[PDB]
């Protein structure tokens, strides 16, 4: 119980898992506050990693309204990724996503998850088309093993 970071995260449940590549991201998030009032900004970043390319892409962003001291639970529905920009190889590969919350432009928490995307029928997996068809990409989040990072920001 050290004396830092007034907003602590208690639990992040991924509600739509597995889901299609094109489905939005359902995050029920519960946290705790204190209470300076500057609203908390939540963002979900898509990071994909090919041979020659490292591609990051901001899926969606939401800001939480009042700063209620105590335990709070809200749901983050993030817009699915823009496959146009993703390197073609990483569409049906392992990628990550970065759920990150921040205060007054300074992020204090960043929860990263492993995402496995793969095709939904056995013949697409055995023989994938020369051009990826995102309609048959089903993503699957390693939600049980979150890679959490915490940073020290100045709230007051």
């Amino acid at each position, epitope marked *: 119980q050290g004396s830092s970071s007034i907003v602590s995260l208690l639990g992040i449940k991924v509600l739509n898992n597995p889901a299609k590549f094109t489905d939005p991201y359902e995050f029920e998030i519960t946290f705790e506050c204190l209470s300076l009032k500057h609203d908390l900004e939540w963002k979900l970043t898509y990071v994909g990693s090919s041979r020659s390319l490292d591609h990051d892409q901001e899926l969606d962003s939401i800001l939480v309204g009042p700063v209620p001291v105590g335990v709070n639970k809200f749901v983050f529905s993030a817009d699915p990724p823009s496959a146009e920009l993703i390197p073609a190889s990483e569409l049906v590969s*392992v990628t*990550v996503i970065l759920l990150s919350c921040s205060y007054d432009g300074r992020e204090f928490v960043r929860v990263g998850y492993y995402v496995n995307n793969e095709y939904d029928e056995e013949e697409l997996r055995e023989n994938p088309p020369a051009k990826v068809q995102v309609d048959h990409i089903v993503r699957n989040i390693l939600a049980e093993k979150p890679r959490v990072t915490r940073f020290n920001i100045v709230w007051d």
Partner: antibody
Amino acid sequence: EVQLVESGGGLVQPGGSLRLSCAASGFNVSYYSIHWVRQAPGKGLEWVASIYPYYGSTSYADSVKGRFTISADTSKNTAYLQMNSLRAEDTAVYYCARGYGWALDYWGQGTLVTVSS
Amino acid sequence: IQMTQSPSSLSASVGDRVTITCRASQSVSSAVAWYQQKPGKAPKLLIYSASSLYSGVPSRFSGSRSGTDFTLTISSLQPEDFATYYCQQDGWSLITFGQGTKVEIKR
């Protein structure tokens, strides 16, 4: 202040059983990941086991799969590595370390675990 | 196990520029970190997520990846940098460490 301190190291006989614990100061163990990394003398780092926040849930190296178990008690703010059916090759220093995303920022000083007859 | 790291040993001089490459099994840039270990002490974090340097590490340390070949670069070797450097791969199911690279002062 933030720090990690392992204990329980010692001598055990082949077949034996030993429980390490690592005591958390500052951060509280419930919000971070907690990992056990071992180093045989004059050998490299080897990852033993990992426990992830919010949902418990454990990863284990195959050499220790089934014999070791990893846990954390938020009330006593400590994590444990219960090593049973110990073998000679588990002889090493056992560091406990706190997770920084996919990495490990803070490391205990490490206890020596000797397994020999 | 143990990812291949090269060179496995290295004699350098102060002010040299060293590059250690870790031949990893996956391309995911988040999952690779780089550690420094002085003898009889716990290893400390240098680079996390392939390229981001841990708070309070000198700017001479820098990490970069190329496919599945991650590398740590020390732009100007300082006396205090002589040590053993390990790379790590926090994978889907396993964590893996490299054999380590020991860097010793030429005299």
